[PDB]
Coordinates of C-alpha atoms and ligand atoms in Angstrom, one line a residue:
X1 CA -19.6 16.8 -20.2
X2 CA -16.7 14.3 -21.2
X3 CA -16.1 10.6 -20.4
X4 CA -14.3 10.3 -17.2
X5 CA -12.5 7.2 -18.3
X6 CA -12.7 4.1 -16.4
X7 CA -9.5 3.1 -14.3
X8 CA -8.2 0.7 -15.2
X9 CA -8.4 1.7 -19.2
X10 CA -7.7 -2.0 -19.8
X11 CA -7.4 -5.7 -19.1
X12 CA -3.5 -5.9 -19.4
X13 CA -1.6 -8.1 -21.1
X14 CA 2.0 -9.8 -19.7
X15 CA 3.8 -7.1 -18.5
X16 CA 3.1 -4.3 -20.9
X17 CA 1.9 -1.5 -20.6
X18 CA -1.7 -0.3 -21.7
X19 CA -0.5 2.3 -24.8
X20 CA -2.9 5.1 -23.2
X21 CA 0.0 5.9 -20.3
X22 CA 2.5 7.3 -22.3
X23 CA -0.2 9.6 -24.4
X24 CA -1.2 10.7 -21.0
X25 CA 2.8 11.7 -20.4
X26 CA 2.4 14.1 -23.6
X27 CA -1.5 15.1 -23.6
X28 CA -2.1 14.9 -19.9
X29 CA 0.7 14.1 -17.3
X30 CA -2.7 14.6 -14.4
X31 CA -6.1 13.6 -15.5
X32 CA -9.2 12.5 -13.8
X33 CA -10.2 8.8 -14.0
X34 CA -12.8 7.0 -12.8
X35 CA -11.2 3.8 -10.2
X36 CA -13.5 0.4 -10.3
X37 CA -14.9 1.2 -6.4
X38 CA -15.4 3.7 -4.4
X39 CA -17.6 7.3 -5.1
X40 CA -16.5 10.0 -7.7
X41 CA -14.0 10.9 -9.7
X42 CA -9.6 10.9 -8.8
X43 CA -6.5 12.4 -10.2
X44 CA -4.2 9.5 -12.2
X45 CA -0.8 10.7 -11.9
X46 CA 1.6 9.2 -14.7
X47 CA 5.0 11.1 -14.5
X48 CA 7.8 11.0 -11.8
X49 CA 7.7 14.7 -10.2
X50 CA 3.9 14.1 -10.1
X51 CA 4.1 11.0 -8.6
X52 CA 7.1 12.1 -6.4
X53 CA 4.7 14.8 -4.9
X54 CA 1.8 12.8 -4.5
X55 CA 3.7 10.0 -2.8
X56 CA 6.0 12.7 -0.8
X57 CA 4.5 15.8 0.3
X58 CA 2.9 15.9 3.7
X59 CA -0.3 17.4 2.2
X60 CA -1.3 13.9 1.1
X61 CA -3.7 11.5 3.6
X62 CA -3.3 8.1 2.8
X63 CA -5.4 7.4 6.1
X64 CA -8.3 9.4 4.6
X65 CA -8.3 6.6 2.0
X66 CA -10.0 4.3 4.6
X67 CA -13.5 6.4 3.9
X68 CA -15.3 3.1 2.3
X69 CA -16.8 6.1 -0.2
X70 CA -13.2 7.3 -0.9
X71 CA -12.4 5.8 -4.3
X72 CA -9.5 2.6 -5.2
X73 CA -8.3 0.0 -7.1
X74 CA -9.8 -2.8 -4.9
X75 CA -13.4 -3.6 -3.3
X76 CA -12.8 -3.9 0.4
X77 CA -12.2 -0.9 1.5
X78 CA -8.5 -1.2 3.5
X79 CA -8.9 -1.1 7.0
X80 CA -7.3 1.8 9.0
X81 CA -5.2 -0.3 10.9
X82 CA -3.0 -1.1 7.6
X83 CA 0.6 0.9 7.8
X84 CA 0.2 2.0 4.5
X85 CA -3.5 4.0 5.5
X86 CA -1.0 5.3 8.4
X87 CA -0.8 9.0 8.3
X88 CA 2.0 11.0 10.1
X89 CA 2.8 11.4 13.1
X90 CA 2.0 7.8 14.0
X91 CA 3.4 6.2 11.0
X92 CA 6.2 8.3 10.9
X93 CA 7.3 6.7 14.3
X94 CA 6.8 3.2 13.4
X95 CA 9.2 3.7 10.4
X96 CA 11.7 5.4 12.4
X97 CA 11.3 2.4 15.3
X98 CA 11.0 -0.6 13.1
X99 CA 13.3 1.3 10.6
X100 CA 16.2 1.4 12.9
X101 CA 16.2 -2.4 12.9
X102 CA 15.4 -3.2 9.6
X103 CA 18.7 -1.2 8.7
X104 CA 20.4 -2.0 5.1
X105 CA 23.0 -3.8 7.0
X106 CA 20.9 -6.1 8.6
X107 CA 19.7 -7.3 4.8
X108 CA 23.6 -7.4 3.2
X109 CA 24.3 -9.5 6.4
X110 CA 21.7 -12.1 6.0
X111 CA 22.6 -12.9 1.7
X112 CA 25.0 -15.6 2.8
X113 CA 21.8 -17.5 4.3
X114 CA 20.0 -16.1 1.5
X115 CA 22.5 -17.5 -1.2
X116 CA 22.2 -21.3 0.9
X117 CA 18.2 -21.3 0.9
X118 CA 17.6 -20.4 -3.0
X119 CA 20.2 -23.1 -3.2
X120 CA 18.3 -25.9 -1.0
X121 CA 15.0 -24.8 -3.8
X122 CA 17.3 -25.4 -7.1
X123 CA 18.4 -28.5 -5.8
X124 CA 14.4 -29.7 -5.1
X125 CA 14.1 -28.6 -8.5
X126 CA 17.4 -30.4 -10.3
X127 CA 16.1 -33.4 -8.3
X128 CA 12.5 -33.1 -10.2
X129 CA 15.0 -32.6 -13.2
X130 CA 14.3 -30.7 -16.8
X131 CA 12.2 -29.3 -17.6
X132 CA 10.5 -27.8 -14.2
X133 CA 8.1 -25.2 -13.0
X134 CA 9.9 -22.3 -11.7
X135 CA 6.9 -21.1 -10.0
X136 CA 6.7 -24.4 -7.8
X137 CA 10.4 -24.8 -6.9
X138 CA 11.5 -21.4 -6.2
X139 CA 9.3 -18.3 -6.1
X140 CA 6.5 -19.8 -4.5
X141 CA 8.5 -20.8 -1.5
X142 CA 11.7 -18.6 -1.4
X143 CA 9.8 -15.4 -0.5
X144 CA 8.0 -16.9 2.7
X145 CA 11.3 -18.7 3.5
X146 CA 13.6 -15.5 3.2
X147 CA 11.1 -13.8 5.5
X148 CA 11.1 -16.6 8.3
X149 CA 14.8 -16.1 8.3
X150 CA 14.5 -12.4 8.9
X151 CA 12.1 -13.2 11.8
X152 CA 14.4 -15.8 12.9
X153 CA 11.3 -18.6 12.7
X154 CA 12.2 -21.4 14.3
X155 CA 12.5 -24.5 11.1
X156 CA 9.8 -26.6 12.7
X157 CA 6.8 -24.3 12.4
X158 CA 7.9 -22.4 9.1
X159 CA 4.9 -24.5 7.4
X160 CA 2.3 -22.2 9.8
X161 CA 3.7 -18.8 8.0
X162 CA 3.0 -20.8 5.0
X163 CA -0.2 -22.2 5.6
X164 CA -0.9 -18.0 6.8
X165 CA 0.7 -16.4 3.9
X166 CA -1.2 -18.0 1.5
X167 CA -4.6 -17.6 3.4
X168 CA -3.7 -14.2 2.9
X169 CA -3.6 -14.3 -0.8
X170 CA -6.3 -13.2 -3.9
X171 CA -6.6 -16.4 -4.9
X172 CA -6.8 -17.9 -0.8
X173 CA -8.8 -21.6 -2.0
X174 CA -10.5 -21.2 1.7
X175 CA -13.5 -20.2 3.4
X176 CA -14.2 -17.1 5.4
X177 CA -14.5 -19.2 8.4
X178 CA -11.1 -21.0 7.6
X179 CA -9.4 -17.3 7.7
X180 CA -10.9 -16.1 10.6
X181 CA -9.0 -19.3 12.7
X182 CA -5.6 -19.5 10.9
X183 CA -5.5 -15.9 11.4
X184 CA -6.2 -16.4 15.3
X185 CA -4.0 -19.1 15.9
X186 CA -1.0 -17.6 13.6
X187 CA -1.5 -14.3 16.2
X188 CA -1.2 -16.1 18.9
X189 CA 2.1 -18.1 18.3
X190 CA 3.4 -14.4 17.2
X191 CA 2.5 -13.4 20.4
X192 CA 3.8 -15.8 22.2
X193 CA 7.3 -15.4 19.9
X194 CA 7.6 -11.5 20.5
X195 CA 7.0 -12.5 24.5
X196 CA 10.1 -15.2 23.8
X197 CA 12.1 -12.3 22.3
X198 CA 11.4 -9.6 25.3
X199 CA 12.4 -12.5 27.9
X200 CA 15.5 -14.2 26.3
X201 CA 16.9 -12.1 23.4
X202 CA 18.0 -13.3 19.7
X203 CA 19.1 -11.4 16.8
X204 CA 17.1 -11.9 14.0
X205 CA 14.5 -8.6 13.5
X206 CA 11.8 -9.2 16.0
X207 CA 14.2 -9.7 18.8
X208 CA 15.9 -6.2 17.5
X209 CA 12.9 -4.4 18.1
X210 CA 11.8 -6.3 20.7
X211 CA 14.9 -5.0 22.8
X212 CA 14.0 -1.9 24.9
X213 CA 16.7 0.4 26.2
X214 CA 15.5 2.2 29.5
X215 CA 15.3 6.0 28.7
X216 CA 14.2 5.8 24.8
X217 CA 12.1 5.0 22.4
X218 CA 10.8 1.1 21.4
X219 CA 7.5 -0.2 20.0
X220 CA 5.3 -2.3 22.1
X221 CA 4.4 -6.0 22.0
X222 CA 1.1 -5.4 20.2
X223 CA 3.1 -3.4 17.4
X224 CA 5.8 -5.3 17.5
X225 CA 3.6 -8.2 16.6
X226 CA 2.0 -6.6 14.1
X227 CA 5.0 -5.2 12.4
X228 CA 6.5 -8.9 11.7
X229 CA 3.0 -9.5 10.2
X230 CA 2.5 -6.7 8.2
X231 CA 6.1 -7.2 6.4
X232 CA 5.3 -10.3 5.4
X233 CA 2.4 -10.3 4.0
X234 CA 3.2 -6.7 2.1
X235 CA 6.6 -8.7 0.9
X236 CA 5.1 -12.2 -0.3
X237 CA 3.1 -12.1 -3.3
X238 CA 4.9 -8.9 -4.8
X239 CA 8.4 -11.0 -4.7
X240 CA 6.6 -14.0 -5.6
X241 CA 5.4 -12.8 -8.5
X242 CA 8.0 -10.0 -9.0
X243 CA 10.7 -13.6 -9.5
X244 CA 8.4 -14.7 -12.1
X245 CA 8.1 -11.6 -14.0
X246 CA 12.2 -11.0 -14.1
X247 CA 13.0 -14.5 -15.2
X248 CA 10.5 -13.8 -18.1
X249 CA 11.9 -11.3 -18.9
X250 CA 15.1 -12.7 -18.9
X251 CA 14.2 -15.3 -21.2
X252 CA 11.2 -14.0 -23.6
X253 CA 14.6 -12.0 -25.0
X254 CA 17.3 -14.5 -23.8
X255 CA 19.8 -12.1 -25.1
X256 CA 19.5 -11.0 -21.7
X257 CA 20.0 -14.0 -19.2
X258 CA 23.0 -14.6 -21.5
X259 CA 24.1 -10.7 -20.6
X260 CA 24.2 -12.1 -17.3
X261 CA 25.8 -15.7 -17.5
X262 CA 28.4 -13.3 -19.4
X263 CA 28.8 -10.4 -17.0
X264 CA 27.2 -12.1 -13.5
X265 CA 28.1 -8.4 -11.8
X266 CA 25.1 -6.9 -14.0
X267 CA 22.8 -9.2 -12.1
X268 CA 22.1 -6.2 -9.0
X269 CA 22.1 -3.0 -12.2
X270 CA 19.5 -6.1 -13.8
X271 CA 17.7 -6.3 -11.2
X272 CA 17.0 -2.6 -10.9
X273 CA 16.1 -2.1 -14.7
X274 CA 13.3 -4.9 -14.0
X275 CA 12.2 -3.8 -10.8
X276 CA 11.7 -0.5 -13.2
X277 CA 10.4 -2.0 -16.5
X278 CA 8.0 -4.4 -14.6
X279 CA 4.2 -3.7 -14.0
X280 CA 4.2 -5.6 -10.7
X281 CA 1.2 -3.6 -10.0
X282 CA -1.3 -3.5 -13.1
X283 CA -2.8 -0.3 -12.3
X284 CA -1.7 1.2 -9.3
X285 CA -1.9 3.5 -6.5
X286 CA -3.0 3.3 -2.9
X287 CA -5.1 7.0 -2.9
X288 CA -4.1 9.5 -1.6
X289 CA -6.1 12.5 -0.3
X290 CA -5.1 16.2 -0.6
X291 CA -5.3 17.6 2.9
X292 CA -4.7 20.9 1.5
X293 CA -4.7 22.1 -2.2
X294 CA -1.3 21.1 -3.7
X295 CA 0.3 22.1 -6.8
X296 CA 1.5 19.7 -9.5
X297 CA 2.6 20.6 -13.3
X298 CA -0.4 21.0 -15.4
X299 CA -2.7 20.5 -12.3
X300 CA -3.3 21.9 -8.6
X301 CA -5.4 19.3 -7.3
X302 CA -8.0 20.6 -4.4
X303 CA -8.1 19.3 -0.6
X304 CA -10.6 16.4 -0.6
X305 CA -9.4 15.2 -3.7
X306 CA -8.1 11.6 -3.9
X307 CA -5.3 10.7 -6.1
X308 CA -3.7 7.5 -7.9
X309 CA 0.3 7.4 -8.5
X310 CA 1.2 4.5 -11.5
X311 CA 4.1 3.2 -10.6
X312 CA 5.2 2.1 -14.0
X313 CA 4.3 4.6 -15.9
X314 CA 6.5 6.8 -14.2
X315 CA 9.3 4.3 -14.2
X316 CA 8.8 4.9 -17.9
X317 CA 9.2 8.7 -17.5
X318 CA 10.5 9.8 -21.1
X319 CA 11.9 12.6 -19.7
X320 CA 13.3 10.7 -16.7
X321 CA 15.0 7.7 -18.9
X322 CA 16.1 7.0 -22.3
X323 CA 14.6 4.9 -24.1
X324 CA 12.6 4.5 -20.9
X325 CA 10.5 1.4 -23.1
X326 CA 13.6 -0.4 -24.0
X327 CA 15.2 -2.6 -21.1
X328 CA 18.8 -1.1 -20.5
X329 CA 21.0 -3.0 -18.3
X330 CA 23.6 -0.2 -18.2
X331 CA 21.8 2.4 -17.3
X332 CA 24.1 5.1 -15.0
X333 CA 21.0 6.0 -13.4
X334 CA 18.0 4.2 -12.0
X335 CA 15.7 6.5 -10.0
X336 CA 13.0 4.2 -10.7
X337 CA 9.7 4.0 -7.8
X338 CA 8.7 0.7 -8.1
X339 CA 9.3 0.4 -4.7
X340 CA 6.8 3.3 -4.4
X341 CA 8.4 6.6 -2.7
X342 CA 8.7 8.6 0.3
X343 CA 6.6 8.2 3.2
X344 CA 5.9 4.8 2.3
X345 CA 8.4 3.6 0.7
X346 CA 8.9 -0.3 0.8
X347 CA 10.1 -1.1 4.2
X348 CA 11.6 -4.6 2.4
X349 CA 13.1 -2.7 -0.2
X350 CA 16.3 -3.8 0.4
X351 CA 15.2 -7.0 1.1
X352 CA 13.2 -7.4 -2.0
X353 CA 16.6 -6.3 -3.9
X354 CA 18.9 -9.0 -1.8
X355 CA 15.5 -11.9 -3.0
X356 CA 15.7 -10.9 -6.6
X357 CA 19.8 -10.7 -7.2
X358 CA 20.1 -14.2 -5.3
X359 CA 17.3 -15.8 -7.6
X360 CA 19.0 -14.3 -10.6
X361 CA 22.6 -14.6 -9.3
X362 CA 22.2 -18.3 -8.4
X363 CA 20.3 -19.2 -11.6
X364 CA 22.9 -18.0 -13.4
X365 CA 25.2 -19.8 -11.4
X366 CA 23.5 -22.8 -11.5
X367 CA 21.8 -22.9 -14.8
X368 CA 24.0 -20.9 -17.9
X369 CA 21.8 -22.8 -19.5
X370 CA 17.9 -21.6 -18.6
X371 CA 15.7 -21.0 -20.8
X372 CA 11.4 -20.7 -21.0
X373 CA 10.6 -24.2 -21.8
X374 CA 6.9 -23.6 -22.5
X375 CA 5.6 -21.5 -25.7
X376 CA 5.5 -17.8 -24.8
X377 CA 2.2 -18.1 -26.4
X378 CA 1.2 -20.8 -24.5
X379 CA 1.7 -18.9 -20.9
X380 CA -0.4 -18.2 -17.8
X381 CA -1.1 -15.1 -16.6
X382 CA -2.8 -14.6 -13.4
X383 CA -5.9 -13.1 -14.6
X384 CA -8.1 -10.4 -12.8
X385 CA -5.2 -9.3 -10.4
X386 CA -4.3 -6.3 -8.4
X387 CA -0.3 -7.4 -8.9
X388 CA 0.9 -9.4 -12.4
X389 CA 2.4 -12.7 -12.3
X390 CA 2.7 -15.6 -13.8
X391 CA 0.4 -18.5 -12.8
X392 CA 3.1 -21.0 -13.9
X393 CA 6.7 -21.1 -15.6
X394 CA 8.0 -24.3 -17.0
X395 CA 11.5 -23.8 -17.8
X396 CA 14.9 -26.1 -19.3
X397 CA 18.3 -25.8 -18.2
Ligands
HEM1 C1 10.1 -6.9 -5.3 C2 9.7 -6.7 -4.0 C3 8.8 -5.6 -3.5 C4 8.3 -4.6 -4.2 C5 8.3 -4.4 -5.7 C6 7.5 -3.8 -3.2 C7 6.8 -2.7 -3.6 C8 6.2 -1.8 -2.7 C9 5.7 -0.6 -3.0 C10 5.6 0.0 -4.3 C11 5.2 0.0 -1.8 C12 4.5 1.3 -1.6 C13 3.0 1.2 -1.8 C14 2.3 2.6 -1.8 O1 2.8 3.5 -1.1 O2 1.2 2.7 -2.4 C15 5.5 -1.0 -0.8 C16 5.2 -0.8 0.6 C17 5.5 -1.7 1.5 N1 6.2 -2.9 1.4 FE1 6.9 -3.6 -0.2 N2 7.7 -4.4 -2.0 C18 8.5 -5.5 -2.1 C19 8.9 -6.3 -1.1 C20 8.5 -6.2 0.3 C21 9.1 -6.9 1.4 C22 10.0 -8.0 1.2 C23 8.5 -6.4 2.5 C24 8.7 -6.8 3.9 C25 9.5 -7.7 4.3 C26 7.6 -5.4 2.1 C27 6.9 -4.6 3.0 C28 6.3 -3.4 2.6 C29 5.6 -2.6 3.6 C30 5.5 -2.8 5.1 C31 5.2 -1.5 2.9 C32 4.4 -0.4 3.6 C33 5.4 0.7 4.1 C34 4.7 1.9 4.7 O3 3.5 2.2 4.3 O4 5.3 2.6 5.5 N3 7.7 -5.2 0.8 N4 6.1 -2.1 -1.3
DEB2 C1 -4.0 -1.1 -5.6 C2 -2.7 -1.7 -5.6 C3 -2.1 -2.0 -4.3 O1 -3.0 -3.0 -3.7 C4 -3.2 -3.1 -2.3 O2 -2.7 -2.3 -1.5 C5 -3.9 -4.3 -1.8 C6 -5.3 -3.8 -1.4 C7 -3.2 -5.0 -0.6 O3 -4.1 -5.9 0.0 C8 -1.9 -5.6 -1.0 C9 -2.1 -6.9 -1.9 C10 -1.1 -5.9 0.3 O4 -1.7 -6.9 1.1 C11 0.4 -6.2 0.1 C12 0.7 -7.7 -0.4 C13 1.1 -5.3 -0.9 C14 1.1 -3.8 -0.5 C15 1.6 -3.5 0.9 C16 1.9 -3.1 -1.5 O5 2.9 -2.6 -1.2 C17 1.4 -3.0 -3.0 C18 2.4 -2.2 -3.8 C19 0.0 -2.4 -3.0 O6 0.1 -1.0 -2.7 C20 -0.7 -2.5 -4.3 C21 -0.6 -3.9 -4.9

């Protein structure tokens, strides 16, 4: 009797947003859509207390997304192992054991080591000299690296979570009976490195929940092995790409890298803004299932009825922020979900935050000077993609 729009309403350009979100925020905040895969029709929420609801309230099964007939933004349908198709009670007790670990103050107290490793990669990169790809020299490799720290890889051996993380990727460049090995073989050493941890104890994040305190609760080897996996993974191609898309941002109006080389302080309140103003993910949500009916503005959505959440569309909330399409790095207030909310709210959240201000904090440091040394018009955007990036960055400093 009507359309049923297809999600996504467009191939997206940059980082922008496709102008159909914000006359969704006016004409209809909660609207059915039709997602690329999957059966039927599902609810895209575009405004914060919508999403909010959707991504908090108990009355939402993400695990009911694993129905290969449930509909989503991608074409194999996730597995139900994945964390984020983890519904409560489960999942709630692997955030509250890995989560008591992977504490804020673990994070703060790793930048130092942080600040000497983006360091080592714009050294590689002043040795290559002007002008140089930023993808290459430091957003490629930082991510993976940070995250070896944080598992407290040993050097030697950091090139196998490379050679995995990237096997692991959209654009992999290897056969299905290339993954199936890698994958073994990367297991195994994990194995083997959570067994290391039990025995003789460290204290990088494995060996913190590897730990196990007689008379309460700890996670098991299997779990524990699987945690360290599943962060990094879920926390390598969103802060690779998430580098990329700040820088440009930061240059495309270099007004703003200069805010920064001005006021260095501004580079964690930047970082925010961006995290805010940037569609990492071009159209968004992992569904979400009504368990039982649940009331938003403007819409009650039904048990059995899958849902999508858009990040940055929210982030955009007119209501929410001021001049919510202009980027604002003095905002009092940034309530922003781009790390999604709730429930499943990035675990590396605060790790993602410590990546980003050391990129920006030591290219300001380093290079007052940056600036986009290929044409804007000239640039590569990954193409076909569940998270926007750039495919390459040459920049001048
Ligand atoms: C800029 C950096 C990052 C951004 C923007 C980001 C964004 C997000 C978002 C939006 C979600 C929620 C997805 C949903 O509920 O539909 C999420 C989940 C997650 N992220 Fe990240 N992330 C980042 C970095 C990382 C890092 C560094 C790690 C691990 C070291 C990580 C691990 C995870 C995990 C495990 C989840 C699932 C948590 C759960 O379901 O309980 N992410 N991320
Ligand atoms: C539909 C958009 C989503 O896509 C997906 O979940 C993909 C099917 C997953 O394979 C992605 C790529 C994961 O492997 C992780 C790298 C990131 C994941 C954990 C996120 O947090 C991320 C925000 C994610 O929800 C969105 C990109």
């Amino acid at each position: 009797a009507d359309a049923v729009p297809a999600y996504p309403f467009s191939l997206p350009h940059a980082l922008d947003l496709d102008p159909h979100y914000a006359e969704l925020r006016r004409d209809e905040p909660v609207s059915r859509v039709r997602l690329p895969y999957g059966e039927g029709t599902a609810w895209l929420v575009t405004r914060m207390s919508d999403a909010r609801i959707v991504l908090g309230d108990s009355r939402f099964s993400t695990a009911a997304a694993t129905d290969p007939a449930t509909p989503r933004m991608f074409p194999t349908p996730p597995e139900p192992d994945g964390v984020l198709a983890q519904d409560p009670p489960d999942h709630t007790r692997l955030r509250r054991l890995v989560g008591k670990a992977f504490t804020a103050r673990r994070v703060e107290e790793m930048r130092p080591r942080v600040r000497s490793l983006v360091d080592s990669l714009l050294d590689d990169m002043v040795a290559h000299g002007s002008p140089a790809d930023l993808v290459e020299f430091l957003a490629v490799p930082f991510p993976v690296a940070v995250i070896c720290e944080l598992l407290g890889v040993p050097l030697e051996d950091r090139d196998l979570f490379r050679t995995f993380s990237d096997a692991m990727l959209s654009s992999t460049r290897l056969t299905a009976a290339e993954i199936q090995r890698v994958q073994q073989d990367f297991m195994v050493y994990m194995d083997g490195l959570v067994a290391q941890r039990r025995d003789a104890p460290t204290e990088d994040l494995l060996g913190a929940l590897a730990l196990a305190t007689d008379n309460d609760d700890h996670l098991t080897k299997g779990e524990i092995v699987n945690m360290g996996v599943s962060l990094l993974i879920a926390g390598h191609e969103t802060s690779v790409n998430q580098i990329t898309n700040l820088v440009h941002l930061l240059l495309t109006e270099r007004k703003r890298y200069e805010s920064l080389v001005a006021d260095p302080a501004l580079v964690p309140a930047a970082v925010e803004e961006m995290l805010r103003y940037t569609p990492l993910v071009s159209a968004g949500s992992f569904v979400r299932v009504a368990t039982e009916d649940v009331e938003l503005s403007t819409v009650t959505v039904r048990a059995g009825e899958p849902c999508v959440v858009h990040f940055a569309s929210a982030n955009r909330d007119e209501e929410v922020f001021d001049h919510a399409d202009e980027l604002d790095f003095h905002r009092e207030r940034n309530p922003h979900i781009a790390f999604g909310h709730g429930a499943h709210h990035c675990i590396g959240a605060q790790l993602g935050r410590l990546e980003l201000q050391e990129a920006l904090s030591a290219l300001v440091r380093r290079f007052p000077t940056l600036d986009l040394a290929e044409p804007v018009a000239g640039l590569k955007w990954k193409q076909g993609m569940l998270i926007r990036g750039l495919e390459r960055q040459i920049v001048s400093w």
